[PDB]
Design a protein around this ligand. Sequence first.
Ligand SMILES: Cc1ncc(C[n+]2csc(CCOP(=O)(O)OP(=O)(O)O)c2C)c(N)n1
Ligand SMILES: Cc1ncc(C[n+]2csc(CCOP(=O)(O)OP(=O)(O)O)c2C)c(N)n1
Ligand SMILES: O=[P-]([O-])[O-]
Ligand SMILES: O=[P-]([O-])[O-]
Ligand SMILES: [Ca+2]
Ligand SMILES: [Ca+2]
Lengths: 620, 620
Amino acid sequence: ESYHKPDQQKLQALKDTANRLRISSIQATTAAGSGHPTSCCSAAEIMAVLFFHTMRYKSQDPRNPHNDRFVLSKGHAAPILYAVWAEAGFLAEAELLNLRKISSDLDGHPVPKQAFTDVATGSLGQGLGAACGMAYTGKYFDKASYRVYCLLGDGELSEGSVWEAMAFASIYKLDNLVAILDINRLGQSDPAPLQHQMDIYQKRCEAFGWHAIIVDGHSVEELCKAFGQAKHQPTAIIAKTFKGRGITGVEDKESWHGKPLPKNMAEQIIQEIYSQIQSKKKILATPPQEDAPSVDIANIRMPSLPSYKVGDKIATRKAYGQALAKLGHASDRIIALDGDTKNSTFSEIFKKEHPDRFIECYIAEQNMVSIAVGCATRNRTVPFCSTFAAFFTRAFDQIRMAAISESNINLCGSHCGVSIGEDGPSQMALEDLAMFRSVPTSTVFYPSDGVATEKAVELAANTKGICFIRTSRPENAIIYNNNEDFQVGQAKVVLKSKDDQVTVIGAGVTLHEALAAAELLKKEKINIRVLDPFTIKPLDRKLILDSARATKGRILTVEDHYYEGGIGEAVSSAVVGEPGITVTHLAVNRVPRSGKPAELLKMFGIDRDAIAQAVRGLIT
Amino acid sequence: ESYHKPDQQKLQALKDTANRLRISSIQATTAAGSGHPTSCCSAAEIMAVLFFHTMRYKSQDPRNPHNDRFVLSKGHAAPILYAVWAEAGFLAEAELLNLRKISSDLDGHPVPKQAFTDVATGSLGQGLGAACGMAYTGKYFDKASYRVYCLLGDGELSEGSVWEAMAFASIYKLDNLVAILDINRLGQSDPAPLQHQMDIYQKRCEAFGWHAIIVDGHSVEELCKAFGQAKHQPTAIIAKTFKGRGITGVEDKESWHGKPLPKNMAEQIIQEIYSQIQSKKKILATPPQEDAPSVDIANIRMPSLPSYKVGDKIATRKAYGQALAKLGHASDRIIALDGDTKNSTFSEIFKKEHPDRFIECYIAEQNMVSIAVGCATRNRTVPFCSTFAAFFTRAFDQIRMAAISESNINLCGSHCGVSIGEDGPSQMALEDLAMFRSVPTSTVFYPSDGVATEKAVELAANTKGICFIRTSRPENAIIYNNNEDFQVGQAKVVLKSKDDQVTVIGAGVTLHEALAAAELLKKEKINIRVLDPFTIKPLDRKLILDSARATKGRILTVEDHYYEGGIGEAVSSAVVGEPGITVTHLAVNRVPRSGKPAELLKMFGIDRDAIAQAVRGLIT
Ligand SMILES: Cc1ncc(C[n+]2csc(CCOP(=O)(O)OP(=O)(O)O)c2C)c(N)n1
Ligand SMILES: Cc1ncc(C[n+]2csc(CCOP(=O)(O)OP(=O)(O)O)c2C)c(N)n1
Ligand SMILES: O=[P-]([O-])[O-]
Ligand SMILES: O=[P-]([O-])[O-]
Ligand SMILES: [Ca+2]
Ligand SMILES: [Ca+2]
């Protein structure tokens, strides 16, 4: 639609709105006794113009799929976000004073229990990546008219994740995306490196492919104009502002980040700001054009059972790619993301069959996770990201925040453990189970053959939370019939007899080492029960205990992972205290080195011979 | 010294060297059956000019403190690094053919068991940050003439960590630092985003404050000239190259990343390259000026015992800052790094007393860890980094690689757990124990009062590996006499009687909740033994077991951390199977929310009342 050039009365109303937003931010943080009023105050005109002139959204339905999106990347400015939603009529004005109380949902940083929040922020430098996912979805998946606005601080621009998102938005021509940079000169404990060198910020944004506009961030007129011109590139509004703007004696001063005003000072300051407001009448939000498509919410089912034959050899990494491509034929909601590793994770199979739903994220794992989080907001897509599991450690903070965001994303990490062989430890995932188990909403799948991998992909697609699938490089035999039923939290006993003397729990390559160890032990008339956990989180505690009680109470765990936080610790925590139950662990005890897969499994004590020796020791 | 303008014979010798390096990279990867010859080949002229014209180093003493530093950020090019060290006469030429063998130290990516490797690479995007630490040390700490050279790939430039390092080097005027960008057009699975748009790379580097020079990366003459001009800024040599340069039919082609040449093809290609070499005579390396200072290696001792009084209240975060500043008066080797959080971690105390040894890293945790790793190389400094513990998750891959690098760095993460109160979960560290316990070389300190914090700082300074100190926001009472002896792996029983019915293990805020719970239980004639672990890794298994056997075998753990990978799992894994021993866990079961510290401890079941209720349940 045409830009509506505001008259002087509308401009004054926007100024009055910005000053109301300042007052509310001060009132709320003074009442709470904590918070960041000076960080809200630098953004007050930006927020007024965005919410009451530029954006299009349903004020009574913040999650509506047709709405423009707003991401508060500088999440500690939450009080001004709450204030705008009260100004728009969604939040009760009195509730603002309950900021940070245990009785309120207006928490210290935004979180998705709030209808107006899609992604939790608070860990700086992540909002723009989420916004890129929203804008990519809007332009290429929803094909809708909504736009995406992301407000960042200047200290926040020191985070490399921001520059990954900048580069992504220009690669993918996200002309529906606007980043607003609140260049208020100061960080938490010192000035931001570039201070008010606006030209340097402009050069950096232009070098990364954005259309960059320097504005006076306290001029509602310059802001209306800058937001009012759509571009053919992602657009950076570089706003020169002052921290604590409007707070006499505090504006542009250090020592005030995250410091509320004391009661006596708040009263005096609020009276000053209030005297600037010319009218109490509020501006109404403007609704969006309703062109986002419907999205089905039904269960996603594989079009057929797995087609593997017991005895055939396939690496679970390849079965992942085959299974994801197969699942893509069943539902248009499945999208795949990969970080320049598609040939090795086998997500290239999905790209070949469903190219319009594959997102190349390049060597930028932090941004890739944030893109997926953004794509999953409002349930618009069901994303599967992949790289080597070791490189998901690069995105741990994004994954941590994804759980705080209640996000439903699926991650597949390949090349786990020492069994990759010659590349050496930089490429070996040995802490990924520890990392993903510590994520509160996570489900951790560790499929041991191609059939289990296909079932894990199907289960993950239909499971809420952060789903992780750990895949492996070596080709192992198919051990499961393709009609075997798999469920989250349900383990499988793959070998048992009446005279079993220990239950051996393995997964992936160590499950096949355990089965080979059972064959070595058969020559010595020693039988062992072999258990495949399928999910490491949640663990099938009942089947583990019933197996243990059938094998003299003895459990041996063996895993291609470090000792801490892995399968062995998960099993020990589950069964500690149970009478007669003992647990013995085999794992990788130190940083590995290069060698053939079988040589490394032997060197680090997790191969069939190490398992057999541990079994004999338990019996004697 | 003056630039030595090479004659045509020296230039031809450098070309011959580059071609020998190609041959060795092909020979080694074909013999191994794996590796990245096309990634070596694009860098061959760069490597020849660096090692045999530009750099100054002792060829027989690669770790010498006077040497120029070289960091191979694109670590998968390891075969060409090994080749240059054979060409320089340090490595035997025959050993190159043992690349990736379990019998060799020429592993798939560089690692510090090699005398010529300071930091392990292999996880892309981290080398430049390490190089910044080396260059900062050289300019500001060593005050020596050595220079630092870092070779990066173009796909690698998608990592945000690279841009954090770029910004750091210009902030700190690292005119002794040179980054060489191998712009060979291709990544692993597709072209790099910018391909051969050399002007865009130049604009990005210039916007981040570097002096940027575009060269033909296969012209030894242009490379000699570009390296030969020192600048007043960090300098980026932007080298236009072709992947697989010199391999007929493979140069500039996709589908060859990480693919060795088959034997029959290697023979043919090597014969072609060999026919280009005009002479077998090798160039000798040139030694450096020996102006790096001596550094003492003695134990670092606090100048006095802690000065806290039993009963005084201090937050361990503040005791950390006081203790680090105190330790800085004892040894000039201590340096401190912080990510714009010095007012909240209290590293500002060190900055005030020892400003020349404080490094402000801004909001860039990945780079901060890499800086510390670089500063610790060759034992030049003893670094302590600090931020909120939650934001160390942003640097997990850097910490993981630091352990592969055998690095001795110290990390202090504040604001752990729900006890921070109103900021909410984005700022709460609830997975940091899981993360740091999974790091192979780690020691994890969790001091419960100011005295333990000071002792932990002293111990950490003298302990090899990745040391982590978990500090807390709330002020708790001093419980230890200031002459109490603390040691790694030694726990403390802080309350005991003869009629204790359970051993309660707490740490930080939950240790003080446990002591308060013991007072509640005293009213009911119930005595509990309270144990403070001091180090979570390694755990004092002996004292835990002896305590348990004195309290009917019952252990209760309580921690301000998620259930997985924390204190409870560490204790359970240590004691599982021990007869009569049971372990019960209290931890945080889900993403928290904002509230007062005591309200959140109650809501998440880890306060004195929850501990008392669990104790009563264990007895009955
Ligand atoms: C990843 C991360 N590191 C550190 C912090 C701690 N922190 C919170 S706010 C802040 C300063 C923010 O400065 P800026 O982005 O300039 O925002 P302003 O408040 O000035 O608008 C810092 C360092 C954080 N929240 N996230
Ligand atoms: C952080 C990280 N993510 C992914 C990988 C997987 N990987 C190894 S090499 C490579 C491509 C490297 O491309 P580039 O930097 O252009 O180097 P070249 O071999 O072309 O010189 C990738 C994606 C990695 N090593 N590290
Ligand atoms: O995909 P690469 O591990 O052979
Ligand atoms: O330092 P902040 O948590 O008050
Ligand atoms: Ca700022
Ligand atoms: Ca490349």
